[PDB]
Amino acid sequence: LSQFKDETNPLSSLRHKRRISALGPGGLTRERAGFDVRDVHRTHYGRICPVETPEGANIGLITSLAAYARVDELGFIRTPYRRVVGGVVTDEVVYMTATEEDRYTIAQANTPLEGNRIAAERVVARRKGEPVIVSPEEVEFMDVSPKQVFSVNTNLIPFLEHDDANRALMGSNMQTQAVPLIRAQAPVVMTGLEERVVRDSLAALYAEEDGEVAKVDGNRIVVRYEDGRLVEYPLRRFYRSNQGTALDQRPRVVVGQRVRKGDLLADGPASENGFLALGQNVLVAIMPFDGYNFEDAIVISEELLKRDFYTSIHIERYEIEARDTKLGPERITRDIPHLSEAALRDLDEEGVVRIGAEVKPGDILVGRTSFKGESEPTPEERLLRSIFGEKARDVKDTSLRVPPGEGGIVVRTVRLRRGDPGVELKPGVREVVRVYVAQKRKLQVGDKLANRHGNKGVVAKILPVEDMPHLPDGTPVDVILNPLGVPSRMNLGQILETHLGLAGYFLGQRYISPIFDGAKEPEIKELLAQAFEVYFGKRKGEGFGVDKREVEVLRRAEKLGLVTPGKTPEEQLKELFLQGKVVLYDGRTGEPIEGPIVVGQMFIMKLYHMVEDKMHARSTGPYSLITQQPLGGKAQFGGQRFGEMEVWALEAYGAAHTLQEMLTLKSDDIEGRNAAYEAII
Amino acid sequence: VVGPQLKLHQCGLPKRMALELFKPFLLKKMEEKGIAPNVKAARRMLERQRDIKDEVWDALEEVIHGKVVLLNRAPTLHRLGIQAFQPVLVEGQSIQLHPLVCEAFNADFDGDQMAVHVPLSSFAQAEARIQMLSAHNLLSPASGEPLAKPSRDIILGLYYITQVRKEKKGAGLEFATPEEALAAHERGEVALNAPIKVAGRETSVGRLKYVFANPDEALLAVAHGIVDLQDVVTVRYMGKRLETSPGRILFARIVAEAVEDEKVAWELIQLDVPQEKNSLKDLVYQAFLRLGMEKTARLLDALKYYGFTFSTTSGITIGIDDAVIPEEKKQYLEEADRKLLQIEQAYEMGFLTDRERYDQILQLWTETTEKVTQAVFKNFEENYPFNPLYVMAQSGARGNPQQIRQLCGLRGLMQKPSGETFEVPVRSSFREGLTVLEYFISSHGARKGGADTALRTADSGYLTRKLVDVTHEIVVREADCGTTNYISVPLFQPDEVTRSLRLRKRADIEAGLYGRVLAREVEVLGVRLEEGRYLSMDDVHLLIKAAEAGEIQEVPVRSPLTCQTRYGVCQKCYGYDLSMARPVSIGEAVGIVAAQSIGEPGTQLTMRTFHTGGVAGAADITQGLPRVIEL
Amino acid sequence: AEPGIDKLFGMVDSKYRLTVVVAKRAQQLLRHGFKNTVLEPEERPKMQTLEGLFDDPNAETWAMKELLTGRLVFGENLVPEDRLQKEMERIYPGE
Amino acid sequence: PAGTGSDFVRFTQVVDQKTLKAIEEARKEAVEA
Amino acid sequence: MLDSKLKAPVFTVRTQGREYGEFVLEPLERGFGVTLGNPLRRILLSSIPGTAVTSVYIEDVLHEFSTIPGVKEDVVEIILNLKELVVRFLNPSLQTVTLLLKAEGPKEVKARDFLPVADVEIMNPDLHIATLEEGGRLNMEVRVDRGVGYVPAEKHGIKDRINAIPVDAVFSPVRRVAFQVEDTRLGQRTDLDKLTLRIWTDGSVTPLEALNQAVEILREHLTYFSNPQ
Amino acid sequence: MLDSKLKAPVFTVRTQGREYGEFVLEPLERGFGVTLGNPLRRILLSSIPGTAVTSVYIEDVLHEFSTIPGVKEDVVEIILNLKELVVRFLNPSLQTVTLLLKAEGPKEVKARDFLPVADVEIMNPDLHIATLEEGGRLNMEVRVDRGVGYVPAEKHGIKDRINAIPVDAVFSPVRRVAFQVEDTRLGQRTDLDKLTLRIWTDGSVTPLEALNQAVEILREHLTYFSNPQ
């Protein structure tokens, strides 16, 4: 029932903390069960999100409770419900047990309310489990808000209403995978819990009571409360999350500043200014490229890397032990027996690697010397040593090297040698050596980014700002999203976000759109209307009108049906802009992209690399003790598995030898793989 | 990660990965060159990253030349689950895969990881790049139908280019007759009334205005801004005065060029329509049989390219004003709404049994729903032929009839936990807010679907195991088995509507006679289908067309069911389909090639309860995988 | 795809057999000495860092490039099993 | 037993017209005295 | 000269400071403004030379992920701010210039704080380096170079002082380019392209300068079409 | 010269006949092949001057859609065939040349039938104008001009003789342009554009010639950026 805290980022830890699962003790439910437990029962309302469950084998088994849901006196999930005596609705609230809720006629938030007055004769309520049109005079209770129907992890989605519950799930789990970027950034459009998430989770550092600031270090903010007291507030500089992501509190308050009780003094790993930030707002054009964004692939603008935009600080921790063998203790000295000093450089401190040293794959992170054979020396190796220099250190080079994949620059090291302080070193363990390595992971091909609606894609190509889609005025688009990944999946909400986003870019503002009660198509079209003047108005004054291109795309557009024929280009482009699309010119040719293309500000996050992304590739290596098949571990990549399903693949084809080798020369033939390598050599 | 310009033939594999994989081959090569004195040397030379002289990459680059590698997918469902490619060493972490083959391995690029193996022996290399290469296994072991085709983005490209437009019909221009009709609607079109694309039967003024002499003449005018590609113009191709669009003419060339037998390029293409994935798929299958294998491969990327290109310019994107809602939705809703009140008053009295009410109400919505569906499309069909959304669905690209319905019209009848569907529909679309309870009502059926995938993402070898256990030994090793006991394939089917003979469907017959070996002769429409002849899909097209006239009701054809070769199956009895399209080549693992084609589609089939249904009153048959099991 | 793969396929009675010939041809193209080839002088194999494929890049790309021509002979029982290897060594130098 | 494992093709040897003449030369040598 | 040639392009310019600079040019025959503006835009962003911080050395700091006492910002936020610094040196002899700076006590270290270098100028004086508090020691050396394009700190790996930390190099002096092609009615026929491209620049070089270099890179490239084969 | 300059563009040519002509050129730094090919393509189609029929006058024919007795083809197919006619004149003095022709009786009126004009030549002689029968009278005047790009017969509306009918103006010797940018490898750095553009031409001029004129129109345009104002 207990596992590694999922602290990929603040939201993940918060969501993991408030998660429910039936898998348990034995007295309580096991795995042959589930079809009726795994379904979303009726009572699951304001009690358990329908959507927040895992995607796959575990479904309905592990679920997270809804936003306002609280376990009162003995664990029966109660949810909020305000009272409505007669045609009157109250600000009083009853945390109700799942059973007593059957007894009453409850109603939804979305019911015209003049205050205490219910406003429409036939307005919806839902008796125990069945949707029912009740009258204002039977409406005993009402629902506090849409927020209670789902979880905290789901309520953060913009216009959830427009997204298929199936895909909103992917959205909610996507966020739990959000990796803190050096450049945090709250979305151009938020739901309303971003603030509460960082605050209730414990990301940012808040001010106890009012006062002034004394000192502001990169390491501490000793504030002065007006009570005649002052406290030093350390800031976890660069600590190692269980999952590798970085947790640093960057001070947002200047020297000598009167603070408002409860205001951010420092920001959490990923918050902008007290607001959750798991990604970055980026201008996006939503069209097809030369198939670079094929099924689900995304093309990225090199311009995004120039700015340290999608860069994330990660910290890997390598460790090595000085073990006690009966052959002789494993020394940890700067003596790596067989070949060079160049390799020794960064191992500076006699043994351990010097701080601030860039370590590339293969370099020595720590040196160790163990003894050579099991019990006996070596007759052939005896002659060789004698020939060039008999006296040689007859010890093995078992030093902790950087694994294929990557290293960064050493930032911290630990060494628990003899005469330990208050530590527990295991038996046989003569002494341990930890080395923390940190690396700036820049957005690169292969990385996967995804918006809160489930558009989860991988970066296929980083384009030179030189040629990707560019707007009438110089600004280029950062990311180009394929449209074909929107019809099948049903989430028009991303297309609703991009539009409102386009307005926010020229309007220089961020908005907040609640879940079932938020922005509306008419209001959006309104803001675009204001955006048209900032985008085209400056254009009119700055000195110039419309292009051959701009007019050309208008023609093909009126023949399309996006613009009322006859109206003037000025008036035509406004119409066209209000629709959410504007004319873009192919940065490669300079010619237009026949037909208006939508563009805008969409919040896209980058997802965390699991240990699987380290591109595995294994030539020759260790082998299991009993079963003689290929096995990895520390440095030599483990072998890939060739399953029956795969076997049949080959069996289907005439691949006779290919199947033979998979069984013989590659994995199990002892004598085989041997003569195999040498033969190849 | 998708590698757009990569050809089927190749795949981009990270140099860094290539180094480890082909290390031994590299080591040796280092010694052939001045880079390293010996192996041990060469090894230490590569033990650390910072130590590699870029001459090593040139050694690796040179080693790989010609050799190929194998790539594998998460579920290895069929033989094509593994394919061979030529490594084109590339920078970084990801593996660059060709787009066409993404159909074979079910792979999207949100994070799927593919494995890769190295055939060592000169033998393993030979089979791997000769018979296991991706370009060579183009048709599937399940259906003769092409597996590798212009799938999602390429269709879209190739479609938009070939499509004709239609605008405002005010002045009744039906020009095929007056000379004054030509002049008047030529002038009127110049004016603001008649369009360039007017329904006027013979030639809307758009054809009256421009005539293009040579082929190219047609596209230059386009480049200059006179003719949009999707516009209806007239042109003088070889021997004909063909009234066909800029785009359609261009497409004709693209193929005509991909394969230089220009006339053989026109014989197998239909420029009479927008190119759908079916017209394209068909284009490939033809190209294959007709020309040659590899030349087909050229045409494939030919399409892949222009498809990608035309695509980006067409500028199809998705805004909110795209999914158009019908104006009839409000009507069909209210009309069905008030009818719902009748059913209630009819109940409020005592006429309908508590059940009658329900079943009658669902009936109402099942129809009303279905009604707005044809409505929305009829809207796009009449008013916006070029809507980004709807187009993706009609071109073989992406979109579902039932899906569009959920955005534009409305998603309307969710079922409860158990299965007894709700009495109340979900009145909304995704365009406007799918409300809270509408959302929660909708949520139920979501889990069931998810719960169903999990029990199934479980074991994929389950079904295909059984088939490979009872079928692996089966292999083609033959001489014409001389036992001609045969099977007769039907062309007519009996009972849906009790007893009304009917021509079997189009496909079902295709799957019964395609590339089989006639047991006995057949004198059908005029032609004489000799005995033992392998019947091509074009022959399987003759027989149906003859059954249409009424000359044949069965078809004598050899098959695995009547075989004499004990542990084997012969050429004449198996038939046509190697991945290739000729006869079967002896020594083909047919047993497993069969066991697979059936283990993959099974994953699409439902999974409620194996020995299906549940004891309750009268649950009568069994659907989905549960039955295929029972069978 | 690959050069005249169809032409090749047509030259054999069974698909799988063509693969066996090429592979066995590639075998001896290396073993008895790589200059055991029927086609070489003007336009036979070639790789570009120089035109250096003339000596030893891919063995079977040759086998195929040869079999596609009409000089080889692949039979079921063409030349007696053990005496073939003897005669070949006697006649092909480069070790 | 199914792919190239087919005894139908497991055995198949290759010739050069040059090695063809060489082997009949071996047979010619078979003539004694 | 009087008729078709004197009707030649009236290259008019409008430029403020060293950053912004509009450039108009008309009349131009059919579809040329576009034809010109586009390549020039492609050059202005990639081919033009520049100057940007390439390495940094802090007093007692050994790696980029540390934080300095009395200094609110952390080393990573500072090396970031340095990428924002735009300098300009006058001639070739100045390939690599190390700018020096050292400040103590309650001060807002701004770019004007660097000690003046003879041939080099700092266009970005008020840019913000740090907020030091009492007992705030900061003595650094920030290198500066002349290059082209974007160079990851990983690719160069600069080495003046062993405890130093490299910075990502972005040299295009051009911040953004833009071009409009609006019709112009010059009296005979009306189809007339009128090109006008707006160039923005960090200050290192100037819009006008950049444009010149740009057109040259294209000319030099049109020359490469000389010896057939 | 050895390193960055000798690594200069290898302009390779392949031209068969005056019509088709491939042109390769590599290596080229990042995104340049495209940068070059595109403008050259925009020029090759519009600026490369040319010559094509601009108007036609038939003996007794008044409208565009009539048919002449003894003449199988119709005026629309004939005026169509004339768009296929490619002529070539030697100097400026020849702006508008009306080519004259008149033939009677069972004859296949071919382009060689036009009476010779001193400063003008017909590259398209055997081209086929008409198939006359008995009592086949055909006396026409086909105008010819020098212009650029495509001009709908609607846009010009030529007026030599009131019963005359204008033809769509096809002046570009270039039939179609085609450019590809495929990667190529120079040692250490793999990102290398390789431009190759395919030019098609009516025969009047040659691919090679066209390309030359094209690059020149761009060069001359890059100098129009000289005198500020």
Ligand SMILES: [Mg+2]
């Ligand atoms: Mg559990």
Ligand SMILES: [Mg+2]
């Ligand atoms: Mg028990």
Ligand SMILES: [Mg+2]
């Ligand atoms: Mg249940």
Ligand SMILES: [Mg+2]
């Ligand atoms: Mg998930």
Ligand SMILES: [Mg+2]
């Ligand atoms: Mg009440």
Ligand SMILES: [Mg+2]
């Ligand atoms: Mg309250």
Ligand SMILES: [Mg+2]
């Ligand atoms: Mg109820």
Ligand SMILES: [Mg+2]
């Ligand atoms: Mg009542």
Ligand SMILES: [Mg+2]
């Ligand atoms: Mg759901």
Ligand SMILES: [Mg+2]
């Ligand atoms: Mg779901």
Ligand SMILES: [Mg+2]
């Ligand atoms: Mg709130």
Ligand SMILES: [Mg+2]
């Ligand atoms: Mg103070």
Ligand SMILES: [Mg+2]
């Ligand atoms: Mg900590």
Ligand SMILES: [Mg+2]
């Ligand atoms: Mg606050």
Ligand SMILES: [Mg+2]
């Ligand atoms: Mg971000």
Ligand SMILES: [Mg+2]
């Ligand atoms: Mg150290």
